[PDB]
Design an enzyme around this catalytic site. Structure first.
Site, mmCIF file in Angstrom:
data_model
loop_
_atom_site.group_PDB
_atom_site.id
_atom_site.type_symbol
_atom_site.label_atom_id
_atom_site.label_comp_id
_atom_site.label_asym_id
_atom_site.label_seq_id
_atom_site.Cartn_x
_atom_site.Cartn_y
_atom_site.Cartn_z
ATOM 1 N N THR A 272 52.362 47.569 25.181
ATOM 2 C CA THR A 272 53.444 48.479 25.540
ATOM 3 C C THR A 272 54.797 47.962 25.071
ATOM 4 O OG1 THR A 272 52.357 49.421 27.520
ATOM 5 C CG2 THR A 272 54.765 49.497 27.441
HETATM 6 C C1 LIG Z 1 42.190 46.146 38.353
HETATM 7 C C2 LIG Z 1 42.063 46.953 37.061
HETATM 8 C C3 LIG Z 1 42.983 47.013 36.023
HETATM 9 C C4 LIG Z 1 42.459 47.862 35.060
HETATM 10 C C5 LIG Z 1 43.107 48.245 33.729
HETATM 11 O O1 LIG Z 1 43.379 47.413 32.936
HETATM 12 N N1 LIG Z 1 43.382 49.637 33.434
HETATM 13 C C6 LIG Z 1 43.989 49.985 32.167
HETATM 14 C C7 LIG Z 1 44.014 51.509 32.010
HETATM 15 C C8 LIG Z 1 42.711 52.179 31.581
HETATM 16 O O2 LIG Z 1 41.974 51.617 30.849
HETATM 17 N N2 LIG Z 1 42.374 53.505 32.078
HETATM 18 C C9 LIG Z 1 41.269 54.176 31.779
HETATM 19 C C10 LIG Z 1 41.151 55.370 32.797
HETATM 20 C C11 LIG Z 1 42.510 55.438 33.533
HETATM 21 C C12 LIG Z 1 43.266 54.403 33.095
HETATM 22 C C13 LIG Z 1 44.499 54.947 32.409
HETATM 23 C C14 LIG Z 1 45.617 55.272 33.166
HETATM 24 C C15 LIG Z 1 46.752 55.777 32.548
HETATM 25 C C16 LIG Z 1 46.765 55.961 31.174
HETATM 26 C C17 LIG Z 1 45.648 55.637 30.425
HETATM 27 C C18 LIG Z 1 44.510 55.130 31.037
HETATM 28 C C19 LIG Z 1 45.417 49.438 32.084
HETATM 29 O O3 LIG Z 1 46.106 49.397 33.049
HETATM 30 N N3 LIG Z 1 45.908 48.974 30.787
HETATM 31 C C20 LIG Z 1 47.252 48.442 30.623
HETATM 32 C C21 LIG Z 1 47.175 47.102 29.904
HETATM 33 C C22 LIG Z 1 48.035 49.420 29.762
HETATM 34 O O4 LIG Z 1 47.585 49.782 28.729
HETATM 35 N N4 LIG Z 1 49.325 49.914 30.205
HETATM 36 C C23 LIG Z 1 50.077 50.851 29.384
HETATM 37 C C24 LIG Z 1 50.825 51.817 30.309
HETATM 38 C C25 LIG Z 1 52.163 51.616 30.612
HETATM 39 C C26 LIG Z 1 52.816 52.499 31.463
HETATM 40 C C27 LIG Z 1 52.123 53.572 32.002
HETATM 41 F F1 LIG Z 1 52.760 54.437 32.832
HETATM 42 C C28 LIG Z 1 50.786 53.776 31.702
HETATM 43 C C29 LIG Z 1 50.141 52.890 30.856
HETATM 44 F F2 LIG Z 1 48.826 53.064 30.548
HETATM 45 N N5 LIG Z 1 41.287 48.289 35.492
HETATM 46 O O5 LIG Z 1 41.030 47.743 36.712
#
Ligand SMILES: Cc1cc(C(=O)N[C@@H](CC(=O)N2CCC[C@@H]2c2ccccc2)C(=O)N[C@@H](C)C(=O)NCc2ccc(F)cc2F)no1
Ligand SMILES: Cc1cc(C(=O)N[C@@H](CC(=O)N2CCC[C@@H]2c2ccccc2)C(=O)N[C@@H](C)C(=O)NCc2ccc(F)cc2F)no1
Ligand SMILES: Cc1cc(C(=O)N[C@@H](CC(=O)N2CCC[C@@H]2c2ccccc2)C(=O)N[C@@H](C)C(=O)NCc2ccc(F)cc2F)no1
Ligand SMILES: Cc1cc(C(=O)N[C@@H](CC(=O)N2CCC[C@@H]2c2ccccc2)C(=O)N[C@@H](C)C(=O)NCc2ccc(F)cc2F)no1
Lengths: 217, 223, 222, 215, 223, 217, 222, 215
Positions: free
Chosen positions: E1
């Site tokens: 990000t």
């Molecule tokens: C505990 C735990 C943490 C995680 C985890 O790493 N979960 C991932 C997210 C993920 O795989 N999923 C799949 C289904 C929904 C959820 C998603 C939500 C919203 C948007 C896109 C996907 C994460 O948190 N990844 C982080 C590293 C990330 O990429 N963060 C970017 C980001 C910033 C701001 C924001 F508002 C939303 C964001 F996704 N899982 O269990």
């Protein structure tokens, strides 16, 4: 409502009228407490803090409850901040709040009348302060004397005509016994002073032989 | 960080640097670490930035709270005690890495003579406090260098102005020897902040005077 | 730190050094570690400074508190008990490095023999308390040296003044062998603090007298 | 039920009518508080926050409780948000709520009448605000002045005559003491303070002794 | 990000990439990370997705809640404090892997100088907050790259268009050197999101404009 | 018990009848709130949620308590589910329950009368909804207007023969001011707000000062 | 476990496998992992069986509870939020080994374009939710295999029948590469379960049709 | 209010008047408690602390609850400080406070009258102390004797006429039963605070010794 509150006011009022009288007056050396008290062991005049003293008239257990509460307040606040932050004005104010709560909410109103007095810290020039707090939380500061308990008009009158600022210790005591008689030996009085010339603890009792001298000597 | 404070005849002065770090990374260049906590006292905090700012804010609020409640300000001893109690209260977080140590500088309107009414009080993580009677004190990662600097420069303090000069030079030496304390930034025009307190109260020192002193110090060290 | 207390005919004396440390770094030069806790007792603490000051201030408040609530002061035994209760209450923190030990010197106005009315009481971190019968005692990182010095010097105590001298010398030997106890500072003019207690009460020993005594010790050892 | 509320209302009304009077009015420099007070240390006028002030009439201990509660509120809100979010409207509102709850639920209603005032921040152009809160939590917005305690009607009329906008400090003080006189006389029996919009931060300041006499 | 924000004459811009990861695996290509939290403020969060979404939603609700309860919106300082408190409350969780760090951009309607009324506030895991005075800021795994890019490009910002361009280009460099920051996807037509705020409020920048800016940057780097 | 409830009902009725009046009526652009109010800063009309507005008559502190509680409820529900799940019917229901409890359980019943209104979400076509909640929790679903406070017969009648569906803003405001001035007016003594169904999200918009004068002529 | 969902013109389809493991051991051959949680939404969960079952059950009860209390069903957003909150609530247990992730498919009766009223939302262990824009999605130990299968097959989807076939083939590749996903069992006649949702609601796909599609896929690969 | 309180006061006074009588006298060897009590194992006189004794008239269960609360207080105070910090004056103070609370707040006021007495510590010289606490918490310091329970005036006057300071054990016992008659082993409960014992002064005088001193 109204009948409950003026019932409490009457009970308290009459209760304080029944009890013995207490005088406090400011003199050149500080503040003087003189109360009519035959007991050898039960005290109506007390130390609160370094330069703050306490007197009461009315029901003993109730103004002793209040006295202890005042010592709790003074020592607590002294510890939480510093000693010099504890003032007679503070103690009189907390007594006002507390007697207001007691009077409106306790099962039976406290039949008491309090005086909180403060003299100056060692070496400073500050006119003494005298506060009267009545059974309903009413609070007034007066510049010269305070009377409590019994029939207050004759004593307040005697002092009204006989009080002189900066009186001697023995002059103050003599006019105090004098005014109180209008309402007496060592065995009938409790006498103490807030002595503005003591280095730390201004409260000092006058008892026994010493008091005997002070009366006539 | 480096915070300094020293007594001068008639008052006290406190000065703080402007740097903020995250490891070796410079995260801040304009931080204000010295707060006027009431009419006669300033507080400078070293440590975790969130904890320091929280401390300054809550301590100022507490003093003014008492003042409005009781009609009169706390004695200086009381101010000391409240600050110490706050530190002692944060000890546990401090051991979890949220550590903040304050330095208090004030003017006791109740002292006997007004030329020595200045007060400098230091603290430790356990809430211990000490009224410094040697004239000066510093806290932060650069406080050793700043103190050993003022040890030599303090004889030159004869009034508020020379006091401010010595404070700024102490901060300059601190930044010279400590990478976590920030020196004067002549490119961006950023300099330490300072408060001076006398009988007329506490006042912020205008940036331009700090800059003047800084440039004099620099042009002196360089020739 | 070193705090000493010894009995002399008709009274007791206590004295403490002025040094504050943060490991090896000297952070204090004029610390007052001996407090007049009431008109007839003085307490001197060693250990974590915040705790020591807390102990002195709070303990004093508690004694005077009882006095004003009850119209009469605590018996000396009661004072001992309250101080021990406080110390025990700090035992967990002490286990976490916030350790502070008091030494108590008093004059019991309710003792029978006015000559042997002096009291010295030592404490441990658990709140254990012990009334010293052999005349002197000390506490702190230099207490061992001071106690062994008083072992040899105590037979010279015959009045308040010789007792004060012995106390200051014991502190001198403590500072001599212990870097956490500060010696007389002739450059700054800072000397140990001392309290003296007899039938007329407890009073601070004026700095000048301690300065004189310290200089006598220094010259003597040259 | 209805008779209990009538009894409480009457006990409060009589309590307030039996007490010294207080006046607060807007003038060129901010807000002026003038209260009959024969004491030297017990205060009926107070500071609540940077630009917000407080005046009360009635039973001392009760409006002193309310005063302390208001300062608690102000400091708490300023801390949880920012100083400038603390407004006189806020405090008058919370006093309305509080005095409502007291009047209907307290063992005895509070025999008090309250005034909350606010002047502009340094350098801003903002007409002063004057709120009044009565013993039953009723709240009123007033643009010129507020009278509380004792016989309020005569004082209110005298002010209705003598008051003018943006008066000087001296004119406002003399007008105010006139109004107070037409309802029942010098420094030893007066408490005077101002919310001074020309101050940089804390507007509340008292006027006592020599300074007061010279007005 | 990567989230970026920067001031321009009369306003402020904030933008953020679209990527979502689970370690190395790409789990999202169109994520929205910049949120219009009130009529004059936008928030952009890095860290755990769930925490960031909850932060934005909760924060917007808090601001509006105050506005309706008290008839007036919070001072900007109060908004800052509120967000800081929300972040500080999440500290234990953040230490256990649920870290979320916000970036705050706003237009202060109560500011003295209307041309410098823009505001950029950064935050750390402990609730620390800092009003940025140097005109730009960024947060996220690509924040350093975007901050150096903007350090070189900022003098080119003279209006809303140039500011928006510099922002998008900083995000471009962020994705260029950080695999966890998504670049412009021209195959799917997915580009960074951006909000712009001036005296007329905060508005979403249409995707097509971000697309034109991206194509311009690409053409500029390719020849 | 029965006589007590009758006394509470009488107290509430007389309190509300002593208060100044408020009208809310549907118009071609949403819902209109007009209430007689001399104050500059104390408000009787208020936003509840995106498309939900509120108006009250009676004692200020009490309907302000209720207004705050309603904002609390709406914001909590919107956060716990989604914004579009908050409806004016919901808030009217919770006000009915809350005022039932208040009327039968508190020391004194609230002397208040509430109106909750809802306009359509942007781009959608739904007739405005009006609900009235009385001091005892009774709740009426009204289709055209709601009158509250003071003497409501004159105003309800003037509106009953001057109200038409889908009037303009200025027309509905003229109708309102006339009907109010009947059973008892300008900018200095009027509070006016609107639920403007043409607004994108937050439909509540006050009409103040120059704009209001411009709509009155 | 593998759960797939995908949008087709005017509706959505969700399908899930039938296996249950205890380590390497097969503990279940006919488990149903795709539940109709309300008239327009189905949920399929992967993970600890007990938690998955409790999720489906409690979730459906919550939606209907709201509907009866308020006379109207939640908006689709509200449904998402409640499901995510439920997932977040289980995060501690999940960190102790009781992990369960849902996948949500639904038809939004309040969507502007009835042709794009299909909805597919995925979740993570922290309660993160993401609405899917690219038409298909999966969850479980075979979710990557199935998602990469549908990346190549999705263009064949023109109506509900082709959507169903593509879903079944996705699950087939999933079980092909993931031992924790169960493939068609022609000996027992057990096949994946599937739900179809369009404007007329959500209904169970009959087993016969899935069996046919399965057999076609099987013989097509020989 | 005053009616409720004077009905409480009346119930207490009558309840005490109906009960047996007790007398406490200061004598050469300490303090003497002599009470009319027919029971074999229901005591009205009790030890409180080393040098502090207790005596009560009225309703048994109530002054037994008070006796127990007093023993609790004394032992707790002595343990938190030192045994010698416990005194009769402060046990009397706390009895006054407790009976005040009981009288104003309990369902029914206690029909009790208490006497707390203190003799000198071993080898010390101090005139005994006698305290009377009545049903409303009123407290009185007495130098010679206290009379409690029933119709007291005959006993009080008998003592005023027959009481001699520093009387011996037998003589004081004699004038005690005498005042009571205005009575033998089978109907008397007597104990003494004996200043001549090293620590625990309270000593009961029963049976053989009791009648032995009744000659
Ligand atoms: C505990 C735990 C943490 C995680 C985890 O790493 N979960 C991932 C997210 C993920 O795989 N999923 C799949 C289904 C929904 C959820 C998603 C939500 C919203 C948007 C896109 C996907 C994460 O948190 N990844 C982080 C590293 C990330 O990429 N963060 C970017 C980001 C910033 C701001 C924001 F508002 C939303 C964001 F996704 N899982 O269990
Ligand atoms: C746990 C934890 C620690 C940290 C951390 O390292 N937090 C840093 C601070 C930091 O990076 N940021 C970036 C945005 C906001 C916050 C900031 C706040 C205020 C001013 C400038 C920045 C810190 O605390 N660093 C320490 C080492 C420091 O530099 N302290 C100097 C300082 C002293 C007093 C003060 F009031 C402010 C200060 F920055 N974060 O989470
Ligand atoms: C946890 C923790 C421990 C410490 C720590 O080691 N704190 C040091 C003290 C210290 O550096 N500072 C600097 C600012 C105020 C405080 C101070 C207080 C009082 C007097 C002088 C200074 C300490 O406690 N050192 C101990 C080992 C010590 O020197 N103790 C001597 C002592 C005994 C009794 C007493 F009352 C005061 C004393 F200083 N800090 O955080
Ligand atoms: C701790 C702990 C963990 C487990 C565990 O791993 N328990 C296994 C399940 C299992 O052995 N048994 C035997 C009796 C009941 C239970 C079962 C429940 C439902 C259906 C079939 C069996 C599991 O949870 N395995 C996981 C890996 C699994 O296979 N999950 C597939 C699945 C998804 C959704 C769903 F709704 C049901 C499912 F079984 N047990 O205790």
């Amino acid at each position: 409502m109204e009948q409950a509150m003026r019932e409490r006011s009457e009970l308290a009022r009459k209760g304080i009228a029944r009890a013995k009288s207490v005088v406090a007056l400011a003199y050149a050396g500080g503040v003087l407490f003189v109360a009519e008290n035959p007991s050898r062991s039960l005290q109506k005049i007390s130390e609160l803090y370094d330069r703050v003293g306490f007197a009461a008239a009315g029901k003993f257990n109730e103004f002793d409850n209040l006295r202890r509460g005042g010592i709790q307040f003074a020592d607590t606040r002294g510890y939480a901040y510093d000693r010099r932050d504890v003032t007679g004005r503070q103690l009189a104010n907390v007594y006002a709040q507390t007697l207001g709560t007691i009077f409106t909410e306790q099962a039976k109103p406290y039949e008491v009348e309090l005086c909180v007095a403060e003299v100056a810290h060692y070496g400073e020039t500050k006119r003494p302060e005298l506060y009267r707090i009545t059974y309903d939380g009413s609070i007034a500061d007066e510049p010269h004397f305070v009377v409590m308990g019994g029939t207050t008009e004759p004593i307040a009158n005697a002092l009204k005509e006989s009080y002189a600022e900066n009186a001697s210790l023995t002059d103050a005591l003599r006019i105090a016994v004098a005014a109180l008689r209008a309402g007496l030996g060592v065995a009938s009085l409790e006498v103490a002073v807030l002595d503005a010339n003591r280095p730390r603890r201004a409260f000092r009792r006058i008892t026994g032989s010493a008091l005997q001298a002070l009366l006539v000597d | 960080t480096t915070i300094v404070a020293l007594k001068y005849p008639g008052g006290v002065v406190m000065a703080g640097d402007r740097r903020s770090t995250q490891g070796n990374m410079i995260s801040g260049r304009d931080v204000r670490k010295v707060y006027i906590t009431d009419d006669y006292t300033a507080t400078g905090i070293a440590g975790t930035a969130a904890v320091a700012v929280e401390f300054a804010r809550l301590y100022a609020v507490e003093l003014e709270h008492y003042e409005k409640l009781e009609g009169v300000p706390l004695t200086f001893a009381g101010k000391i005690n409240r600050l110490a109690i706050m530190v002692r209260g944060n000890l546990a977080a401090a051991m979890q890495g949220l550590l903040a140590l304050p330095l208090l500088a004030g003017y006791d309107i109740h002292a006997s003579d007004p030329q020595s009414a200045g007060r400098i009080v230091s603290f430790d993580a356990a809430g211990g406090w000490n009224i410094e009677e040697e004239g000066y004190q510093a806290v932060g990662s650069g406080s050793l260098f700043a103190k050993s600097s003022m040890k030599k420069l303090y004889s030159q303090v004869t009034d508020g102005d020379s006091g401010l000069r010595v404070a700024v030079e102490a901060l300059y030496d601190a930044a010279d020897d400590d990478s976590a304390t920030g020196g004067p930034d002549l490119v961006r025009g950023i300099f330490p902040t300072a408060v001076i307190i006398d009988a007329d109260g506490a006042v912020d020192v205008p940036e331009s005077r700090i800059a003047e002193l800084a440039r004099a110090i620099i042009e002196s060290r360089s020739g």
